[PDB]
Structures are given as structure tokens and as C-alpha cells.
């Protein structure tokens, strides 16, 4: 008796098609919006996606009342899910992030496989013995595609007479593909490459959602009739309702070991020699090593690097995100952080791996590791509108600008030993960057007389570098190797570059930059966020070739690109804080020790003391 | 047949000052997850969506509106009430068919007391020719809404022959206006001389009158 | 504009149009029939739920039914089942509510409303009604149409003076009133209609003006009772 497993929003249920009139048994309850379902029969596992909890979860069918979270981040509308029972992998689609992703069965080693030309991806079906995956897309260009389960050889197999392709399944016995179209009111079948397409049933399908198969019978769920229907897989005859009055039928499978035929795993017993993911592949040797999202596979084709070498770090008002710069997909991963209300400026310390960011609603400077763990408050008093922040990775100090207080201030990196460095002639201070090797800080002011200014790292010898043809200089970035500084101006709508002494000024970008805010340089590239275009973009600093990194993301703010671990440059503050009891503030002419309020330097020029009454 | 999901709002009406925080509750008779929407309905206008999915602010809606809750208990909060927020507010579950609505919460704006300007209008001669006479008393731009309007005809208090109507709260100055209409046969109107509208709020009484014998 | 570039000011500012136009309402005797239309524009008709929702006078909101125009599928409230039929014409982007065997308790303003989101989406907001038409009034009554008589409320010899128009003895609702063809709006109060024991409605519209203008300015109430094709322009003068 073919058992049918289906998702039902608040629960997952099992019904036997033989006695379909009977009450369906509840497999898992307490769910919110369970949508996609699949299983690993040999492992006794049932998986489901929940689109309100934004999670994929699993349970063991034998035991009871133990729901295991598998994927709980990075999901918005995970509408389709498929288990690779041969290679032991999990695949899913997401129609809001526009991605197809793969992971191990426990959710580890997640990798985004496809991120382009996905609009409303939905159903996904696997042929692990042939290394091919199939999925539907009911979006602007509706289609059925096929690709390697390693992400290779992507091909459109059906692109005509298609509109809402909601359901998709495979017949492993006859090597056939079946799908249901909820607009064109039919179920069709074809070979695995799309050829010899044939109509199975036509007209009795108000709103089919998911389709499955067992022996010579197709089974599908229908959103408008709230039921599971069935017909003969060759002729469409004998159409009938198996099970009715279902609250909200979603994905469905024939729950059987025979629907997951056993074959040799090409990965063997050594995971193919792959350090991380061993994915089924449709070409000899029929596996392919892969790496987590953003991570490069080395030359041997087997061993992953240790994480991304370079990251783009984003503040985005209500969250922070990181994007690897190592791979072409530019997947933004949201950091797991608490109480992010209005994050604005961001920087990063590669020595300890701390991101630092400002927030003018929390009114605090905070830091964390690149995944959101280790999160700590750094500065909480007299924070008002801190629109710029910079890490001094050499002297281990933290700088910020605040247009709510009209100051530039410095602390140690953990927020202690605070000193006001600039407290006059700041109207709208914003971006701030540091050159510890040379002894300078630079900052922008977008007030009524806009400026780019320079001072020593103690705020002394203040000088205006640029005060003409500026308006809203929001972004600032040094090119340490080339002796240049770049800026983005949201009023003149320009990205400009000049030597750090103010010579050689010239316009780099002039078009389609209506409102830069975030702004950073790494290697050959300048990156920015644009408040009006709602995009992250970059330009090659010599060729001026532009690339869109992310489009249509609201609430973009500050941006910093960085090597994750490597730092360059030094000065005498790096050695025992210069001997300074409190702050060591380097200048081109030599370091100056400094003190928080109420302390004074004594005659050794190093030690701060509260002076006697 | 399955029971309709009952949405129970509270309070049925409330009055709060400009700047107050206002909270409205909505309880569902079945667990509806976060599938709850809130609407604002100004008088004589279609409902406008404020919140969906229990807490998501709909595009264009001011940020003083917010929502929260899950399961069966939901709330709508107006964090700083504005004079233009006079309206009836409805919750609705969007979880299953049929969509069902709460009975609504009428929000009134509390303001300082304002005494009415009172006016009395005799029937027109053109109406008098038709066998019926309408006498109208107008209470203009006053607060609070509650007022006692009594008709006196030759110093005899009238009973059973008048009806009142009240405008909606003014979206600018939060006052009301009220009309009271006294209806008489032509013969009865011509039987008496003095027509008076007495208006009382608290210890404050004002009377406007006309005499048929004027002119 | 400096506010443009401020994190705090940009936030405080934030802190092709979809349209649904109903027609068809009016007075109908019990047992009779009426067809309402809802003309949609500004969105892909067939990707949406289209709802009908009704509101009896002084009462709350009651869902009537919906259609998904992509395939014409419908749902209905038990209170209208079998008597009301919803349909749609994709070529005209119009939905319809055919109302048969009408009952007195079907009297209501009838709104059509668009469900939010896409009809084929997994995260389905189709019962969230994100745009509502203006409504059309259906009155089910055996009483016949009657247009109003309009009488002056004359300014007294008494500063600020009050004047107005009394709009008496009409059926069904509604009446609209304007002053000086819409040129006079400040200080106007048009009261809700009251149902008189005769079964006919009456209302007054008033306006306060400076008492100096009583000799120099002319004041005209413009009364329209569309149900009876009765339009009246009444001059209000001191007596
Ligand atoms: C926050 O940072 C402060 C600055 O220190 C610098 O950063 C830390 C993370 C570390 O890398 C230091 O080496 C850096 O200089 C910390 O204050 C400093 O803390 C150190 C101890 O870690 C302390 O050194 C001692 O100094 C005495 C002489 O008085 C000597 O006998 C010891 O052998 C040792 O050298 C510094 O004096 C101290 N600086 C000042 C100006 O007080 C701070 O540490 C915390 O607060 C200080 C006052 C001490 O109580 C520490 O024990 C305590 O951990 C950091 N805060 C936190 C929460 O980590
Ligand atoms: C820009 O700032 C000038 C003064 O700062 C100089 O330029 C910086 C980039 C930096 O190198 C710094 O070391 C320099 O000292 C202004 O010139 C000054 O203007 C005032 C006001 O008229 C005048 O009293 C000073 O003598 C003059 N200093 C000079 C010329 O060195 C610029 O002002 C403009 O240029 C002036 C000649 C004058 O026409 C004024 O009206 C102009 O605004 C500043 N430029 C702008 C666009 O504000
Ligand atoms: C799944 O299929 C594989 C491949 O056919 C099979 O493993 C093969 O089994 C044959 C004998 O039937 C051996 O001669 C092959 O060398 C062997 N190949 C490999 C790569 O191991 C699996 O059977 C395995 O597990 C069985 C117990 O579950 C055992 O009897 C087999 O000897 C073998 O170890 C097939 N798995 C299942 C569960 O049927
Ligand atoms: Na999408
Ligand atoms: Na400022
Ligand atoms: Na601009």
C-alpha cells in the first residue's frame, strides 16, 4: 500500500492511498508553515522546510518528539527541498533569495550552487545515480532546468508551453520526468532531456502544487480542492480523489524505499578524497569536490582553503552581513547578532577578527566575530550620531566620528581610556580612515563648507586637503600601497582619487552614482553602497570597469572590504604601547602619549596621573 | 462544517489625548500563527491596510503604528496619537477561509473642553406652505460630545418630536458639531409664539430663541 | 536638501497606481437582482485574489466571497451562498458580483478589494486586503425612490453667523452637499442623515461665515441626490 507523505503547514501527515478515506496520521505537529518535504528512507529521516520559521528541520520517523534544526539562517521562502539519499546531501530552492543551495544531511558545509537567472524557483527532484538535478521556475521566464548536482552543466530543458510549473518528479524505472502546470491546467511528461514530451492529463487541475509517483500511479496535491488526486501515469485515466478536506496540502512524496533506489556511491568510503563536500556529478568519476559558500577549492581539486581570504563587511540598519570576495557568487550571509536597531558605520580588526560597528538608536559601538559570536558592547556613553568608525590595527586603538556630539574620539579597542581628539570646526563629520604606518588620520565633513581633512593620529597639525568641488563627501578609502586616497560624494555624484598630499586629483566615476554612502577599497577594487539605487557595486581602480555585487537590497549603510587575517604596517606604538600608560598616538614626527580626561602626563612623557588638588 | 474564526477586539471604543500611547487587542478563537492584519477606517471611506503578518508595517504607513502577537493574542499600538487618527480600527485573520474581522475599535481624540456656539433656525416660509415645520438648533465646534439639547415651545418642554445628528470628530481641532431638529405640523407651529433651544453641558446652560411675532 | 544626506533625518521622513473602481449599486426591491462591477488597473489581474467585502450601515466588515481570475475559481460566505455569484472577465480586467434573490439584510456598502501578494506563492498574503475600492451602496427595500426638498436655514440678525440648508424627505441614501460649487469648504458641517418615522431621510448642512459677508457674498448649497436624478442649487439669504 503506497504511503503518501505530505506537508500541511501546521503538521506533516502520512496517508495510505489504499484506504485514503481514512484519517491521515500526523507525523510531526507544532509547525508554522511547513511547505517542502522529503526523506532519507535508509536513515529513517524526514525533512521539511518551514517558510515562516525560515528553517529546514528533520526528525527520525521511528523515534518521536525530537525535531532537529538543519538550516535556520539565510532562508526567506524555501519552497522546495530534496534529499540526496546516495551522496547524503540536502538540496533546496529559495524563491526570495533566488538561490539553489546544497549541504550535508546535518546542514553542515552549506554551499550556494546557483544564484543567477532564478526568479521563482520551486520544485526540485534528484537523480543521484546519474548526478543530475531538475527544478522548476514559475517566474518571469518560466522554465524547467537540469544541472549537475555539483552545480555543473546547467541547461534549460523545457521553456515552451509553461507558466506555473509547480510540481516535478522523476520515474527512475522508466527514466521519465513529470510535471504539473497550475496555470495551463495539465500534467506533462518527457524524457530527462525534455524530448518526446507527452500530455498525461489535461483540465482537472485547478491549482496543483506538488507531484509524486509510485508504480503506475501519479499523485498530486491541489491548493484549490484541498485534496490529493491520482491518475494513471501513462494514460491519465482513472483520475480520482485519494484524500480530501486537507487544511493546506503542500509538498508530497511516495514514502517508500523503492522510491530511493540503491546504487554505488562514487565518493566511496573516503568522501572522494574531498576535504569538505563530495557532490554527485554527471561526468566521470561521477563525483566532484566542493567547498562551503565563498571558499575556494585549491589546485588539487580536493582540498578547500580555510574560509574566505577576503570579505566585504556590510552594515544594513537592522542587520550586518558578510560577503566573500573569493568566489563569483557574492552571497551575503547575515550575522547572528542581538538587538541591531540602526547600524551605520563598520570596520574590522584582522588581528583578533573583530568587526566594529556603530548604531545611533542603540547609541553604542559594539564588536563581534565575523559570524556574530563573541558580541560585546565597546562604547556606550556620549554616543549620539556616530556615522564613521575606524580601527587602528597597529596601536590597537579605535576611532570614531560623531555628528551628534561634533567630535572625533579615540579609545583602546575594548573601549576604555577615551580621549577627545577633535572638538571644533566639525559640522557634519562622517567618514574616517587611518594610516598608522605614516601617522595620519583623514576624515570627511559634509556640512555647509564641506571638507576632507587630515591630522596626525593625535589630532594635531590639522590641515584641509580638499575644500573645492565637494558637497556630500560620504565615503573615504586609502590605497596604502599607492599613496592615494579615494572618496565618494553623494552631492557632486563623483568618485575621485588623489595622492595623499592633495596632488593628482582626478575623477574616477561620474555616472549612475546618485548617492554613495558606504565606501571601501581592497586590492584592485573600490566598493560602495548607494542609498538611492539600493545596491552594492564595485569599480576596478585602473580600468573603471563596473560590476554590480548586489542589487535591490534596502537599508544599505557602511561597507568595509578586508583581508580576513593579514595586516601590514607598523610603528613604535606596537611595542608595549610605546611605553604609554594609557594612549599611544603616533605622529609622523614620533609618537605622543596621551590621557583620558582628568589625567595629566608627568615628566616621563609616558605615565598619566590624576594631579593632586 | 468548520467554525469561522472569531476575532474579539477590545476595547470597543476608547478616548485618548494627542500624544498618548494607545493599545488595542484582538483575540482569535483559533491559533492563526501570525496571519493577522489591521486596518484603519475613516468615516465614509474604505479601510486602509496598516499592518500585516501581525507585525509588518505596510508600505506608506506612519511608523507610529505597530503590531505584535502570535497564536491567539494580537495587539495594535499607536505610540503617539495624532488628531487625524480618529478612526475605527479592525483586526482580521488572514489564515484561512472565510477571512473574518474583529468588531472594530472606535478611537476618539480627547482634548480640552470647548463650549458650543449655538444657533436656532425657524422653518422656512416655503416649508410652512407644505403642512410641516422643521425648527433646527445647531451646536457648533464643541467638546466633549455629550450635550443635553432640550426644545421649549412657549416654555413647554417638548417630547418625542425631535431628532439629533452629530458630525464625526474634526480631524484638525477634534471638536464635534450637533444638529437637533424639531418637527411639528403647520397647525401646531402656528399655535405657539416662542421657540427655544436650551443647551446644557455641566453647569453651563445657553438658550437661543426666536419669536414668530418678530418683524 | 541637507536632510537627504542625514541618517537621522532620512529616517524621520520615512517614519501606474493600483485602482479598483466599483459600479452598479442602487435601490432594488427584495427578491430582485443587481450586478456590481469592479474595474481593476495597475496590476496583473490574473495573479491576484479579488475579494468582495460588505459593510451594513453602522456595522462592521463582512467578507462576501473571492475569485482568482487566473482560472475563475471562487469561494463564498454561507450568508450569500447560492444567491450571489462572482465572475471575472480577464480581457476587461473586471470582476463582477451577480446578486440574485436579494434580501433586506443584504443592504450594505459593497467593496471590492485586492488580496496582497501572488496567488501562486507559498507565503500567501491573498487574504490580506491591501487595496480597497471606494464602495458602492446597495439598498434592498420595497420603498420607492424620492428626491429631497431643500429649504434654507437663514442667517439670523445676531461677529460670526451661521446658515445652511435643510435637505428633507429623500430615499434612498445618499445625498451630497457642497457650498458655492465647492468654493466654500472651511467651516462646513454636513450632518449624517437621520431616518425619520416616515421612513424618509433628512439632513442639514451648515456653514459659519463672517456676519459682514451676509450683505455682499451670496451663499448657495448644491444638493445632489443621484438615486432620483435630483440636483438643487438653493440660495440662502437673510429673512
Ligand atoms: C580594556 O583594555 C585596557 C587597555 O589594555 C589594552 O588592551 C588589553 C585588551 C590588553 O591587550 C592590554 O595589554 C592593552 O594594553 C585594559 O587595561 C589595562 O589592562 C592591563 C592588563 O591586561 C594592565 O596591565 C597591567 O598593568 C599593571 C601596572 O599598573 C602591571 O602591574 C601588570 O603587570 C600589567 O602590566 C594595564 O595597566 C591596564 N591599563 C590601564 C590604563 O589601566 C583593560 O583591562 C582591565 O582593566 C585594567 C584597569 C585592569 O584592571 C585589568 O586587570 C582589566 O582586565 C581592558 N578591559 C577588559 C575588560 O579587558
Ligand atoms: C578653500 O580654502 C582656502 C584656504 O585654505 C587653503 O586651501 C586648502 C585646500 C589648504 O591647502 C589650506 O592649507 C589653504 O590655506 C580658501 O582661500 C581663502 O579664502 C579666504 C576668504 O576669501 C581668504 O581670506 C584667504 O586669503 C584664502 N586663502 C588662500 C587663497 O590661500 C578658499 O576660499 C576660496 O578662495 C578665496 C581666494 C576666495 O575667493 C574665497 O571667497 C573662496 O571661497 C576655499 N575654497 C572654497 C571653495 O571655499
Ligand atoms: C547498494 O549497492 C551497492 C553497489 O551494488 C552494494 O555494494 C556492492 O555489493 C556487491 C554484492 O552485492 C559487492 O560485490 C560490491 O563490491 C559492493 N560494492 C561496494 C562499492 O561496496 C550495496 O551492498 C552493500 O551492503 C550490503 C548490506 O547492506 C552488503 O550485503 C554488500 O556486500 C555491500 O557491502 C548496496 N546496499 C544495500 C543496502 O543493498
Ligand atoms: Na524571487
Ligand atoms: Na553635527
Ligand atoms: Na546625488
Author numbering:
A (entry chain A): 20 to 632
B (entry chain L): -2 to 212
C (entry chain H): 226 to 240, 1000 to 1052, 1052A, 1053 to 1082, 1082A, 1082B, 1082C, 1083 to 1100, ...
What sentences appear in the manuscript?
To initiate signaling, Wnt simultaneously engages the extracellular cysteine-rich domain (CRD) of a seven-transmembrane receptor Frizzled (Fzd) and an extracellular domain (ECD) of the coreceptors LRP5 or LRP6. The activated Wnt–Fzd–LRP5/6 complex inhibits the destruction complex, leading to the accumulation of the transcriptional coactivator β-catenin which translocates to the nucleus and induces the expression of Wnt target genes. However, these binary complexes lacked LRP5/6 that interact with Wnt through their ECD consisting of four Tyr-Trp-Thr-Asp (YWTD) β-propellers flanked by epidermal growth factor (EGF)-like domains. The structure of the ternary haXWnt8–mFzd8CRD–hLRP6E1E2 complex resolves the basis for coreceptor binding by Wnts, revealing a modular determinant that not only controls LRP5/6 domain specificity, but also appears to differentiate the non-canonical Wnt5a and explain its coreceptor independence.
